[PDB]
Please model this.
Amino acid sequence: VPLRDELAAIRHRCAALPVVDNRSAEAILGYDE
Amino acid sequence: PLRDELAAIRHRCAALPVVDNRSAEAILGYDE
Amino acid sequence: MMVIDTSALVAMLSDEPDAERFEAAVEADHIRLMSTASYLETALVIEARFGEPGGRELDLWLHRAAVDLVAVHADQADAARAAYRTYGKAGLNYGDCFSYGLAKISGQPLLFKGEDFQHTDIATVA
Amino acid sequence: MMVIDTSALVAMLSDEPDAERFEAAVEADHIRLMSTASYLETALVIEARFGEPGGRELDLWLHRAAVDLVAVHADQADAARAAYRTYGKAGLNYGDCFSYGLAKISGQPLLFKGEDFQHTDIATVALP
Ligand SMILES: [Mg+2]
Ligand SMILES: [Mg+2]
Model:
């Protein structure tokens, strides 16, 4: 119920999901040429 | 007649000096 | 109606090959839509290539083509997000997403040059 | 009011070292905006990294923070376009221009992390 926890839950959940793509940050955008 | 203008603009714009010739990608900040 | 990506303006303004066919296209149908963010990508590419005098010519082209600069609405952003998992990285860029977005939503064909933007869900302009 | 940049959301959604400090700042300001192109950018980076279950967590974060997704109107693109002459590249990339544009037309401070928005004519939300 308090937003601060709600976002921590979301973060920790999302954070803890598998890395289907370790191509990091800028190559995802099609911008490594 | 529309066609003339976009040719005039194109020719007129194309004839500017090239101040940076780097790739489109790189000048958008996507090359570090 | 039509949509014009950054590829077909950065092309024309730089007098790349077949720029006159892109003019005929611009001529062939009267209302021409462009995504405020494709326009922006176009505005940066021009003004680094040719400086601010590049921008004058860019600005003249857009006013003399009577272009309607369409806002990136949420619905466009969701079609791109949606479509990127299939067609993103040949591929499809972040910059391309706004042309895709506007097109998929507006339902209009897309003027462009380059490999990307072939083999996607939306129509290509001949 | 605030505006948020993808650099921030992605920091938070990827449990980056600072992440807690951003939560505290998001929590402190109850009115929040994001450009649809900065929302779109995160989406691609999250969904690529974690799959659509990541996307799901993005959509849920956005829903609870009640974040305003703001259309990228012509006026913002101009300010962005103009700024980049001054602050592009040691500065902004094409993607940063969207959060940049919204902050200046809104006049609202920008929550980000990293270097790209360090030295620019728009205010920043500082961390607590
Ligand atoms: Mg494009
Ligand atoms: Mg950004």
Remarks:
- Chain B has one domain: 1-32.
- The first helix of chain B runs from residue 3 to 14.
